Coordinates of all heavy atoms in Angstrom, one line a residue:
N284 N 84.7 153.4 70.1 CA 85.5 152.4 69.3 C 84.8 151.0 69.2 O 85.4 150.1 68.7 CB 86.9 152.3 69.8 CG 87.6 153.7 69.7 OD1 87.5 154.4 68.7 ND2 88.4 154.0 70.7
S285 N 83.6 150.9 69.7 CA 82.9 149.6 69.7 C 82.2 149.4 68.3 O 81.9 150.4 67.6 CB 82.0 149.4 70.9 OG 80.9 150.3 70.8
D286 N 82.0 148.1 68.0 CA 81.3 147.8 66.8 C 79.8 148.2 66.9 O 79.1 147.7 67.9 CB 81.3 146.3 66.7 CG 80.7 145.7 65.4 OD1 79.9 146.5 64.7 OD2 80.9 144.6 65.1
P287 N 79.3 149.1 66.1 CA 77.9 149.6 66.2 C 76.9 148.4 66.1 O 75.7 148.6 66.6 CB 77.7 150.6 65.1 CG 78.8 150.3 64.1 CD 80.0 149.8 64.9
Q288 N 77.2 147.3 65.5 CA 76.3 146.1 65.4 C 76.3 145.3 66.7 O 75.4 144.5 66.9 CB 76.8 145.2 64.3 CG 76.5 145.9 62.9 CD 75.0 146.1 62.7 OE1 74.5 147.2 62.4 NE2 74.2 145.0 63.0
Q289 N 77.3 145.5 67.6 CA 77.4 144.8 68.9 C 78.0 145.8 69.8 O 79.1 145.6 70.3 CB 78.2 143.5 68.7 CG 78.1 142.6 69.9 CD 79.0 141.4 69.8 OE1 79.2 140.9 68.7 NE2 79.6 141.0 70.9
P290 N 77.3 146.9 70.1 CA 78.0 148.0 70.9 C 78.2 147.7 72.3 O 77.5 146.8 72.9 CB 77.0 149.2 70.7 CG 75.6 148.5 70.6 CD 75.9 147.2 69.8
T291 N 79.1 148.4 72.9 CA 79.4 148.3 74.4 C 79.2 149.7 75.0 O 79.3 150.7 74.3 CB 80.7 147.6 74.7 OG1 81.8 148.4 74.1 CG2 80.8 146.2 74.3
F292 N 78.9 149.7 76.3 CA 78.6 150.9 77.0 C 79.5 150.9 78.3 O 79.8 149.8 78.8 CB 77.1 151.0 77.4 CG 76.2 151.3 76.3 CD1 75.9 150.3 75.4 CD2 75.6 152.6 76.2 CE1 75.0 150.6 74.3 CE2 74.8 152.8 75.1 CZ 74.5 151.8 74.2
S293 N 79.9 152.1 78.7 CA 80.6 152.2 80.0 C 79.8 153.0 81.0 O 79.0 153.9 80.6 CB 81.9 153.0 79.8 OG 82.8 152.2 78.9
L294 N 79.8 152.6 82.2 CA 79.2 153.3 83.3 C 80.0 154.6 83.6 O 81.2 154.5 83.9 CB 79.1 152.5 84.6 CG 78.4 153.1 85.8 CD1 76.9 153.2 85.7 CD2 78.7 152.2 87.0
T295 N 79.4 155.8 83.3 CA 80.1 157.1 83.5 C 79.7 157.9 84.7 O 80.4 158.8 85.1 CB 80.0 157.9 82.3 OG1 78.6 158.1 82.0 CG2 80.6 157.3 81.1
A296 N 78.5 157.5 85.3 CA 78.1 158.1 86.6 C 77.3 157.1 87.4 O 76.6 156.3 86.8 CB 77.3 159.4 86.3
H297 N 77.4 157.1 88.7 CA 76.6 156.3 89.6 C 76.5 157.1 90.8 O 77.3 157.1 91.7 CB 77.3 154.9 89.8 CG 76.5 154.0 90.7 ND1 76.8 152.7 90.8 CD2 75.4 154.2 91.4 CE1 76.0 152.1 91.6 NE2 75.1 153.0 92.0
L298 N 75.4 157.8 90.9 CA 75.1 158.7 92.0 C 74.2 158.0 93.0 O 73.0 157.8 92.8 CB 74.5 160.0 91.6 CG 74.5 161.2 92.4 CD1 76.0 161.6 92.9 CD2 74.0 162.3 91.6
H299 N 74.8 157.5 94.2 CA 74.1 156.8 95.2 C 73.3 157.8 96.0 O 73.7 159.0 96.2 CB 75.1 156.2 96.2 CG 75.9 155.1 95.6 ND1 77.0 155.3 94.7 CD2 75.9 153.7 95.7 CE1 77.6 154.2 94.4 NE2 76.9 153.2 94.9
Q300 N 72.1 157.4 96.4 CA 71.1 158.2 97.1 C 71.0 159.6 96.4 O 70.9 160.6 97.0 CB 71.5 158.4 98.6 CG 71.4 157.0 99.3 CD 70.1 156.3 99.2 OE1 70.1 155.1 98.9 NE2 69.0 157.0 99.3
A301 N 70.9 159.6 95.1 CA 70.5 160.7 94.3 C 69.2 161.4 94.9 O 69.1 162.6 94.9 CB 70.3 160.3 92.8
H302 N 68.3 160.5 95.3 CA 67.1 160.9 96.0 C 67.0 160.0 97.3 O 67.7 159.1 97.4 CB 65.8 160.8 95.2 CG 65.8 161.8 94.1 ND1 65.5 163.1 94.3 CD2 66.1 161.7 92.7 CE1 65.6 163.8 93.1 NE2 65.9 162.9 92.2
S303 N 66.1 160.4 98.2 CA 65.9 159.6 99.4 C 65.0 158.4 99.3 O 64.9 157.6 100.2 CB 65.4 160.5 100.5 OG 64.0 160.8 100.4
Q304 N 64.4 158.3 98.1 CA 63.5 157.2 97.7 C 63.7 156.9 96.2 O 64.5 157.5 95.6 CB 62.1 157.6 98.0 CG 61.7 157.6 99.5 CD 60.3 158.0 99.8 OE1 59.4 157.3 99.2 NE2 60.0 158.9 100.7
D305 N 62.9 155.9 95.7 CA 62.9 155.5 94.3 C 63.1 156.7 93.4 O 62.3 157.7 93.6 CB 61.7 154.8 93.9 CG 61.5 153.4 94.4 OD1 62.3 152.9 95.2 OD2 60.6 152.7 94.0
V306 N 63.9 156.6 92.4 CA 63.9 157.6 91.3 C 62.9 157.1 90.2 O 63.1 156.0 89.7 CB 65.4 157.8 90.7 CG1 65.4 159.0 89.8 CG2 66.4 158.0 91.8
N307 N 62.0 158.0 89.9 CA 60.9 157.6 89.0 C 61.1 158.0 87.6 O 60.5 157.5 86.6 CB 59.6 158.2 89.4 CG 59.0 157.4 90.6 OD1 59.0 156.2 90.7 ND2 58.4 158.1 91.6
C308 N 62.0 159.0 87.4 CA 62.2 159.7 86.1 C 63.5 160.4 86.0 O 64.0 161.0 86.9 CB 61.0 160.6 85.8 SG 61.1 161.5 84.2
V309 N 64.1 160.3 84.8 CA 65.3 161.1 84.4 C 64.9 161.7 83.1 O 64.3 161.0 82.2 CB 66.6 160.3 84.4 CG1 67.1 160.0 85.7 CG2 66.3 159.0 83.6
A310 N 65.3 163.0 82.8 CA 65.0 163.6 81.6 C 66.1 164.6 81.3 O 66.4 165.5 82.1 CB 63.6 164.4 81.7
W311 N 66.7 164.5 80.1 CA 67.8 165.4 79.7 C 67.2 166.6 79.1 O 66.2 166.6 78.3 CB 68.7 164.7 78.6 CG 69.5 163.5 79.0 CD1 69.2 162.2 78.7 CD2 70.7 163.5 79.8 NE1 70.2 161.4 79.3 CE2 71.1 162.2 80.0 CE3 71.4 164.6 80.5 CZ2 72.3 161.8 80.7 CZ3 72.6 164.2 81.2 CH2 73.0 162.9 81.3
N312 N 67.8 167.8 79.4 CA 67.4 169.0 78.7 C 67.7 168.9 77.2 O 68.8 168.6 76.8 CB 68.1 170.2 79.3 CG 67.6 171.5 78.9 OD1 67.6 171.9 77.7 ND2 66.9 172.2 79.8
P313 N 66.7 169.3 76.4 CA 66.8 169.1 74.9 C 67.7 170.2 74.3 O 68.1 170.0 73.1 CB 65.4 169.2 74.4 CG 64.7 170.1 75.4 CD 65.3 169.7 76.7
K314 N 68.0 171.2 75.0 CA 68.9 172.3 74.4 C 70.2 172.6 75.2 O 71.1 173.1 74.5 CB 68.1 173.6 74.4 CG 66.9 173.6 73.4 CD 67.3 173.5 71.9 CE 66.1 173.3 71.0 NZ 66.4 173.0 69.6
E315 N 70.2 172.2 76.4 CA 71.5 172.4 77.2 C 72.1 171.0 77.5 O 71.6 170.3 78.3 CB 71.2 173.1 78.5 CG 72.4 173.2 79.5 CD 72.3 174.1 80.6 OE1 71.4 175.0 80.6 OE2 73.0 173.9 81.7
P316 N 73.2 170.7 76.8 CA 73.8 169.3 76.9 C 74.3 169.1 78.3 O 74.9 170.0 78.9 CB 74.9 169.3 75.9 CG 75.2 170.8 75.7 CD 73.9 171.5 75.8
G317 N 74.0 168.0 78.9 CA 74.4 167.6 80.2 C 73.5 168.0 81.4 O 73.8 167.6 82.5
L318 N 72.5 168.8 81.1 CA 71.6 169.2 82.2 C 70.6 168.1 82.3 O 69.8 167.9 81.4 CB 70.9 170.6 81.8 CG 69.9 171.1 82.8 CD1 70.4 171.1 84.3 CD2 69.4 172.4 82.4
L319 N 70.5 167.5 83.5 CA 69.6 166.4 83.7 C 68.6 166.7 84.9 O 69.1 167.3 85.9 CB 70.4 165.1 84.1 CG 69.6 163.9 84.4 CD1 69.0 163.3 83.1 CD2 70.5 162.8 85.1
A320 N 67.3 166.5 84.7 CA 66.4 166.6 85.8 C 66.0 165.2 86.2 O 65.8 164.3 85.3 CB 65.2 167.4 85.4
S321 N 65.7 165.0 87.5 CA 65.3 163.7 88.0 C 64.2 164.0 89.1 O 64.1 165.1 89.6 CB 66.4 162.9 88.6 OG 66.9 163.6 89.8
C322 N 63.4 163.0 89.4 CA 62.4 163.1 90.4 C 62.1 161.8 91.2 O 62.5 160.7 90.7 CB 61.1 163.7 89.9 SG 60.2 162.5 88.9
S323 N 61.5 161.9 92.3 CA 61.5 160.8 93.3 C 60.1 160.6 93.9 O 59.3 161.5 94.0 CB 62.6 161.0 94.3 OG 62.6 159.9 95.3
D324 N 59.9 159.4 94.4 CA 58.8 159.1 95.3 C 58.7 160.0 96.6 O 57.7 160.1 97.2 CB 58.9 157.6 95.8 CG 58.3 156.6 94.8 OD1 57.5 157.1 93.9 OD2 58.5 155.4 94.9
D325 N 59.8 160.6 96.9 CA 59.9 161.6 98.0 C 59.3 163.0 97.7 O 59.3 163.9 98.5 CB 61.3 161.7 98.7 CG 62.3 162.4 97.8 OD1 62.0 163.0 96.8 OD2 63.5 162.3 98.1
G326 N 58.8 163.1 96.4 CA 58.2 164.3 96.0 C 59.1 165.4 95.4 O 58.6 166.4 94.8
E327 N 60.4 165.2 95.5 CA 61.4 166.1 95.0 C 61.8 166.0 93.6 O 61.7 164.9 93.0 CB 62.6 166.0 95.9 CG 62.4 166.4 97.4 CD 63.6 166.8 98.1 OE1 64.7 166.8 97.5 OE2 63.5 167.1 99.3
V328 N 62.2 167.1 93.0 CA 62.9 167.1 91.7 C 64.3 167.6 92.0 O 64.6 168.4 92.9 CB 62.2 168.1 90.7 CG1 63.1 168.3 89.4 CG2 60.8 167.6 90.4
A329 N 65.3 167.0 91.3 CA 66.7 167.5 91.4 C 67.1 167.9 90.0 O 66.8 167.2 89.0 CB 67.6 166.5 92.0
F330 N 68.0 168.9 89.9 CA 68.7 169.3 88.7 C 70.2 169.0 88.8 O 70.8 169.3 89.8 CB 68.4 170.8 88.3 CG 67.0 171.1 88.2 CD1 66.2 171.4 89.3 CD2 66.4 171.2 86.9 CE1 64.9 171.7 89.2 CE2 65.0 171.5 86.8 CZ 64.3 171.7 87.9
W331 N 70.7 168.4 87.8 CA 72.1 168.0 87.8 C 72.9 168.4 86.6 O 72.3 168.6 85.5 CB 72.3 166.4 87.8 CG 71.3 165.8 88.8 CD1 70.1 165.4 88.5 CD2 71.6 165.4 90.1 NE1 69.5 164.8 89.7 CE2 70.5 164.7 90.6 CE3 72.8 165.5 90.9 CZ2 70.4 164.2 91.9 CZ3 72.7 165.0 92.2 CH2 71.5 164.3 92.7

């Protein structure tokens, strides 16, 4: 319902310690809505 010329955003997720170190990347699946992959300085990938 915000003005597209001056849009507003809401925080809808805030996952603390998603990884054990810096998160370097987030990437949404281009075909499955809501599937998110992330990765970290700790060498791990997570799927959400």
Side-chain angles (χ1 to χ4, degrees):
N284 298 319
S285 68
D286 184 346
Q288 289 298 130
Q289 191 186 324
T291 56
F292 289 73
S293 299
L294 181 71
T295 56
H297 182 171
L298 201 53
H299 294 77
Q300 295 310 132
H302 293 283
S303 73
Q304 289 183 48
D305 285 7
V306 191
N307 284 319
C308 180
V309 282
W311 294 107
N312 193 292
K314 294 293 175 189
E315 173 168 339
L318 178 53
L319 179 73
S321 65
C322 71
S323 179
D324 277 342
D325 70 13
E327 294 200 2
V328 171
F330 302 82
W331 315 87

